[PDB]
Amino acid sequence: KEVEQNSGPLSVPEGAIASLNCTYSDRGSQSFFWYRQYSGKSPELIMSIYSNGDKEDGRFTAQLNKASQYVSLLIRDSQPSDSATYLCAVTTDSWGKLQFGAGTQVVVTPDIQNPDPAVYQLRDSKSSDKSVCLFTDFDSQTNVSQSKDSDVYITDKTVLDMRSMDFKSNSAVAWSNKSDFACANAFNNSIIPEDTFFPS
Amino acid sequence: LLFGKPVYV
Amino acid sequence: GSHSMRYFFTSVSRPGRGEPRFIAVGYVDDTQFVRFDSDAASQRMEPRAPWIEQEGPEYWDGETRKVKAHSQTHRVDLGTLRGYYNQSEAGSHTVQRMYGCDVGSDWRFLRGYHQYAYDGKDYIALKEDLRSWTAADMAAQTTKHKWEAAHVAEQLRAYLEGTCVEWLRRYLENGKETLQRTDAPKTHMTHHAVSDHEATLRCWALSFYPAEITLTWQRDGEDQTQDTELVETRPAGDGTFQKWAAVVVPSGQEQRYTCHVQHEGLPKPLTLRWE
Amino acid sequence: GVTQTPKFQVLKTGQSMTLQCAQDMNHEYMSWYRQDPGMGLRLIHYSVGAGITDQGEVPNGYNVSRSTTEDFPLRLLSAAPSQTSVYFCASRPGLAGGRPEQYFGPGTRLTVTEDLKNVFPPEVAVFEPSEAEISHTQKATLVCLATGFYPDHVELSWWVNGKEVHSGVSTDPQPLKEQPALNDSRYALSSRLRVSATFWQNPRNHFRCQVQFYGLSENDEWTQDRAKPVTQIVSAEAWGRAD
Amino acid sequence: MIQRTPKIQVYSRHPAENGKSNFLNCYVSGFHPSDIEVDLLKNGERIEKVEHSDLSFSKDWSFYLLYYTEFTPTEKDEYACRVNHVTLSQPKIVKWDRDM
């Protein structure tokens, strides 16, 4: 391991501090970089640091300590659009390989004020061969769990930011092909709140 | 230890 | 006390005769510790002091790689400068760079430098604020623009105030016995007459480190440096240095002609009268 | 900055492919990476100037050249399933001037399969907001299901009334394996579009979920009695229900 | 372009004593360009086993270079340094003087 990063993933709620750390092995390293990569696109350069101490730019502060071989990135006042994986990069010279860490993924949780968790049944528009259960508006502490066997396809929790009445909501979708399957029997093996609305 | 970024004149 | 690390690079083109000769040398005070010569056997950065030999292989690869990067820049620089000054392909030209940093007695940053010359005269230089450039002529003004857009001063300042001083401090502890020693000059005075009308008096300082020394002649109080022959401080070859001072003197006043020696290895400075 | 071509590729075992990479900035030092979930960025080949190249940590099956400083193509002569990755071109000044930084290309997702009858377009359905959601929340979540596709080379978008929307939509970050045990397992992707109930109940507005597929080209040969899974767009719609 | 003639000092590392092993030095300095031919001579004949330092320069960009050989001084053996450079119409011979 040439460049070692922070484990991952990192959950922080919006407004809070995401602190990232990084370690390199080469004493003669002279150049230090933080890159940001959103899922499905390319690493984008956000900070360069060259001297010991702090470098502030916007909401990012970098920190470098060359004695302990430590590079650091703080994100003040986090936003949902900071949700990415953050790559640490270190090099010695003009001709040396820029050494990348494996990256730490940062997940920035939306504040929901007062959650009402609910599982709704959806039917299709035209003529599909299934239905869908939508688990929505739930808590940011609520983790949805895995697929049951090779029948029940359960997606991960994701966030929508309705630029309307400033409403944010967590949502997840489960579906199955054959209907020996309701909305109650979709999240049986999932840590779901006891005041979850179940209408049909 | 040498400087790591020499650049053309 | 005060300490310094400098690197010196020289690159000379060989028209009709292939790649330029490239020589890089590193010093800490007046003590050489690394070299690279493009005509040498190893084709690597090589140690020249015992206290730097203890660096592991990654130091030796890295320095070798980087000194190769430097040779290249200078190679392209010889081609570039010949274009800037419209000179022919027939002649040999010389590029020189010197960079490094000084620390004081507490080992904190004092000053950093980065100087560049073409054909033995100033081409471009980093100013003392490590933020700005002095270009020697209009041709060097082109380089100045090029390096402002490449943020070279920012990149150099980071090195000269950080890396350079961090690494010098490392060398000074590793090299303690060698680099923090002070050798006082073994002093010595000689008489050589010519034809019984004049007499040369020669003051000698031998075996000193570091190279900085002052020898002054003095006709009993007022200093006689409107007659003095002073040679360049020359290396003895063993890490120490030698220098001499001389006056052509009338046969009688050799009693009242005194030689004054100043070196930091001496507690009190020395006075030499002929006897 | 750095541009690279193409964005997506399907190949069968044995085919040859070149990835282009071009660079605007007089950079001497260009490089090729592959990114994989288990092991971050890995350097394949690199070049510190025109004419001149050398190998990274994973050079095997890859072949590279550099006759001009601008361009740095990466060639695969005979594709293997292990070359299924996201490939990034990167470039960096070296000894040249400008900003002392390395920048990346936007990437090429490549998938290599044993049989190209494994390639399938997605099936796309728009599901309609729960009337129980409308009555309880005053908001209307439309979900879209893209199912059955291989490889996972899609771009999903929502288009209300003919113009693309961004504000209600949460799309999944990465597609999901339908049979997560097989190498050639087909994929599914879900997205959400949440508008208020007093916009869904308008019968004038047409909601459309659009999934772009990257598949076979015009010059690929198709012997199966299916329909040839070319690059195409698959859409599903719903109209606003008058209730 | 700058041209500078070298200054040349021929001397020994330790004070000279006949029959005692020493080093003979030829220090050339203050020169430009760096192309220089330096040989140590014993009674006219060229000495093979001569080492030199790596090329460096001073504050005014002029070069310096030490050439050296192990030797055992006697009364009768003459030592010199032979230097050639563009700034010289013929090469320079500087003889070793032990009081210098």
PDB file of C-alpha atoms in Angstrom, chain A residues 33 35 37 39-43 45 48 50 87 91 93-98 100 102 116 120-126 128 130-132 134 136-137 150 153-156 158-163 167 169 171-173 175 197 199, chain D residues 29 33 35 41 43 46 48 88 92 94-95 100-106 109 125-130 132-133 136-137 139 141 143 145 147 166-174 176 178-179 188 190 192 194-196 236-238:
ATOM      1  CA  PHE A  33      -3.688  16.488  -4.092  1.00  0.00           C
ATOM      2  CA  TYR A  35      -9.615  14.617  -6.052  1.00  0.00           C
ATOM      3  CA  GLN A  37     -15.212  11.562  -7.966  1.00  0.00           C
ATOM      4  CA  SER A  39     -20.280   7.841  -9.003  1.00  0.00           C
ATOM      5  CA  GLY A  40     -20.203   7.175 -12.718  1.00  0.00           C
ATOM      6  CA  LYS A  41     -17.872  10.044 -13.641  1.00  0.00           C
ATOM      7  CA  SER A  42     -14.226  11.097 -13.566  1.00  0.00           C
ATOM      8  CA  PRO A  43     -11.904  12.274 -10.781  1.00  0.00           C
ATOM      9  CA  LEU A  45      -9.160  17.992  -8.870  1.00  0.00           C
ATOM     10  CA  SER A  48      -3.512  21.036  -4.109  1.00  0.00           C
ATOM     11  CA  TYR A  50       2.543  21.916  -1.151  1.00  0.00           C
ATOM     12  CA  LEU A  87      -9.139  10.352  -3.741  1.00  0.00           C
ATOM     13  CA  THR A  91       3.965  12.461  -5.858  1.00  0.00           C
ATOM     14  CA  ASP A  93       8.566  14.736  -8.945  1.00  0.00           C
ATOM     15  CA  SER A  94       7.969  15.675 -12.568  1.00  0.00           C
ATOM     16  CA  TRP A  95       8.598  12.070 -13.638  1.00  0.00           C
ATOM     17  CA  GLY A  96       7.303  10.104 -10.633  1.00  0.00           C
ATOM     18  CA  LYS A  97       3.997   8.214 -10.701  1.00  0.00           C
ATOM     19  CA  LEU A  98       1.184  10.150  -9.044  1.00  0.00           C
ATOM     20  CA  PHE A 100      -3.537   7.370  -5.685  1.00  0.00           C
ATOM     21  CA  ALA A 102      -8.166   3.693  -2.896  1.00  0.00           C
ATOM     22  CA  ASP A 116     -43.247   9.638   8.229  1.00  0.00           C
ATOM     23  CA  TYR A 120     -46.778   2.413  -0.910  1.00  0.00           C
ATOM     24  CA  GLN A 121     -47.903   0.009  -3.661  1.00  0.00           C
ATOM     25  CA  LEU A 122     -47.450   1.157  -7.303  1.00  0.00           C
ATOM     26  CA  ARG A 123     -49.143  -0.300 -10.424  1.00  0.00           C
ATOM     27  CA  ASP A 124     -47.866   0.351 -13.937  1.00  0.00           C
ATOM     28  CA  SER A 125     -49.066   2.657 -16.690  1.00  0.00           C
ATOM     29  CA  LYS A 126     -49.190   0.341 -19.712  1.00  0.00           C
ATOM     30  CA  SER A 128     -45.676  -4.529 -17.358  1.00  0.00           C
ATOM     31  CA  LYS A 130     -44.876  -6.753 -12.131  1.00  0.00           C
ATOM     32  CA  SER A 131     -45.609  -4.168  -9.465  1.00  0.00           C
ATOM     33  CA  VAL A 132     -43.459  -2.053  -7.167  1.00  0.00           C
ATOM     34  CA  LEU A 134     -41.900   2.232  -2.600  1.00  0.00           C
ATOM     35  CA  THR A 136     -40.331   6.626   1.253  1.00  0.00           C
ATOM     36  CA  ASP A 137     -39.934   9.731   3.525  1.00  0.00           C
ATOM     37  CA  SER A 150     -33.233 -14.514  -6.386  1.00  0.00           C
ATOM     38  CA  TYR A 153     -34.933  -7.201  -5.942  1.00  0.00           C
ATOM     39  CA  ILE A 154     -34.292  -4.468  -3.382  1.00  0.00           C
ATOM     40  CA  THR A 155     -32.572  -1.138  -4.266  1.00  0.00           C
ATOM     41  CA  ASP A 156     -30.429   1.061  -2.019  1.00  0.00           C
ATOM     42  CA  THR A 158     -31.300   7.403  -2.278  1.00  0.00           C
ATOM     43  CA  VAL A 159     -32.153  11.091  -1.823  1.00  0.00           C
ATOM     44  CA  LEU A 160     -34.313  13.480  -3.853  1.00  0.00           C
ATOM     45  CA  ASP A 161     -34.118  17.253  -3.456  1.00  0.00           C
ATOM     46  CA  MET A 162     -37.461  18.717  -4.595  1.00  0.00           C
ATOM     47  CA  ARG A 163     -36.604  22.368  -5.348  1.00  0.00           C
ATOM     48  CA  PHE A 167     -38.629  19.051   0.755  1.00  0.00           C
ATOM     49  CA  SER A 169     -36.878  12.619   1.007  1.00  0.00           C
ATOM     50  CA  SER A 171     -36.607   6.510  -0.946  1.00  0.00           C
ATOM     51  CA  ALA A 172     -36.022   2.882  -1.900  1.00  0.00           C
ATOM     52  CA  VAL A 173     -37.810   0.500  -4.305  1.00  0.00           C
ATOM     53  CA  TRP A 175     -40.036  -5.424  -6.727  1.00  0.00           C
ATOM     54  CA  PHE A 197     -47.536   3.377   7.328  1.00  0.00           C
ATOM     55  CA  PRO A 199     -51.828   1.128   3.269  1.00  0.00           C
TER      56      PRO A 199
ATOM     57  CA  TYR D  29       3.084  13.318 -19.434  1.00  0.00           C
ATOM     58  CA  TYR D  33      -5.660   3.940 -15.855  1.00  0.00           C
ATOM     59  CA  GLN D  35     -10.605   1.596 -12.342  1.00  0.00           C
ATOM     60  CA  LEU D  41      -7.004   3.240 -10.029  1.00  0.00           C
ATOM     61  CA  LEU D  43      -1.780   2.391 -14.101  1.00  0.00           C
ATOM     62  CA  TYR D  46       2.366   5.885 -19.480  1.00  0.00           C
ATOM     63  CA  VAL D  48       6.613  11.261 -20.487  1.00  0.00           C
ATOM     64  CA  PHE D  88      -9.330   6.812 -17.648  1.00  0.00           C
ATOM     65  CA  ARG D  92      -0.088  16.221 -16.731  1.00  0.00           C
ATOM     66  CA  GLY D  94       5.864  16.868 -16.975  1.00  0.00           C
ATOM     67  CA  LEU D  95       8.579  19.316 -17.842  1.00  0.00           C
ATOM     68  CA  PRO D 100       1.378  21.895 -12.326  1.00  0.00           C
ATOM     69  CA  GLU D 101      -1.624  19.508 -12.062  1.00  0.00           C
ATOM     70  CA  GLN D 102      -2.827  16.217 -13.485  1.00  0.00           C
ATOM     71  CA  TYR D 103      -6.260  16.142 -15.098  1.00  0.00           C
ATOM     72  CA  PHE D 104      -8.418  13.204 -16.101  1.00  0.00           C
ATOM     73  CA  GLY D 105     -10.449  12.270 -19.157  1.00  0.00           C
ATOM     74  CA  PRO D 106     -14.175  11.569 -18.701  1.00  0.00           C
ATOM     75  CA  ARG D 109     -16.895   2.012 -19.696  1.00  0.00           C
ATOM     76  CA  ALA D 125     -41.873   0.817 -17.471  1.00  0.00           C
ATOM     77  CA  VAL D 126     -43.266   3.921 -15.715  1.00  0.00           C
ATOM     78  CA  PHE D 127     -45.187   3.085 -12.558  1.00  0.00           C
ATOM     79  CA  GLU D 128     -47.851   5.491 -11.306  1.00  0.00           C
ATOM     80  CA  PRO D 129     -48.107   7.389  -7.950  1.00  0.00           C
ATOM     81  CA  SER D 130     -50.000   5.716  -5.129  1.00  0.00           C
ATOM     82  CA  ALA D 132     -52.595   6.503  -0.840  1.00  0.00           C
ATOM     83  CA  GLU D 133     -49.419   8.658  -1.223  1.00  0.00           C
ATOM     84  CA  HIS D 136     -51.390  11.296   2.796  1.00  0.00           C
ATOM     85  CA  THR D 137     -48.440  13.435   1.621  1.00  0.00           C
ATOM     86  CA  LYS D 139     -46.975  14.687  -3.248  1.00  0.00           C
ATOM     87  CA  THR D 141     -43.756   9.888  -6.685  1.00  0.00           C
ATOM     88  CA  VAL D 143     -40.928   5.485 -10.389  1.00  0.00           C
ATOM     89  CA  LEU D 145     -37.984   0.642 -13.993  1.00  0.00           C
ATOM     90  CA  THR D 147     -34.946  -3.969 -16.516  1.00  0.00           C
ATOM     91  CA  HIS D 166     -33.783  17.617 -12.756  1.00  0.00           C
ATOM     92  CA  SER D 167     -35.525  18.843  -9.608  1.00  0.00           C
ATOM     93  CA  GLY D 168     -37.715  15.965  -8.508  1.00  0.00           C
ATOM     94  CA  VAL D 169     -35.469  13.167  -9.692  1.00  0.00           C
ATOM     95  CA  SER D 170     -33.437  10.663  -7.689  1.00  0.00           C
ATOM     96  CA  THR D 171     -31.828   8.088 -10.051  1.00  0.00           C
ATOM     97  CA  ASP D 172     -29.900   5.051  -8.701  1.00  0.00           C
ATOM     98  CA  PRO D 173     -26.098   5.638  -8.669  1.00  0.00           C
ATOM     99  CA  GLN D 174     -25.236   2.305 -10.348  1.00  0.00           C
ATOM    100  CA  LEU D 176     -28.172  -3.776 -10.010  1.00  0.00           C
ATOM    101  CA  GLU D 178     -30.760  -9.354 -11.633  1.00  0.00           C
ATOM    102  CA  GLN D 179     -29.004 -12.685 -11.193  1.00  0.00           C
ATOM    103  CA  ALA D 188     -31.860  -3.352 -13.661  1.00  0.00           C
ATOM    104  CA  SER D 190     -34.684   2.396 -10.920  1.00  0.00           C
ATOM    105  CA  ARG D 192     -37.866   8.358  -9.023  1.00  0.00           C
ATOM    106  CA  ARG D 194     -41.548  13.396  -7.300  1.00  0.00           C
ATOM    107  CA  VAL D 195     -43.881  16.235  -8.194  1.00  0.00           C
ATOM    108  CA  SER D 196     -46.710  17.624  -6.058  1.00  0.00           C
ATOM    109  CA  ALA D 236     -42.027   4.656 -21.114  1.00  0.00           C
ATOM    110  CA  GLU D 237     -44.684   7.239 -20.373  1.00  0.00           C
ATOM    111  CA  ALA D 238     -47.656   8.077 -18.207  1.00  0.00           C
TER     112      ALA D 238
END
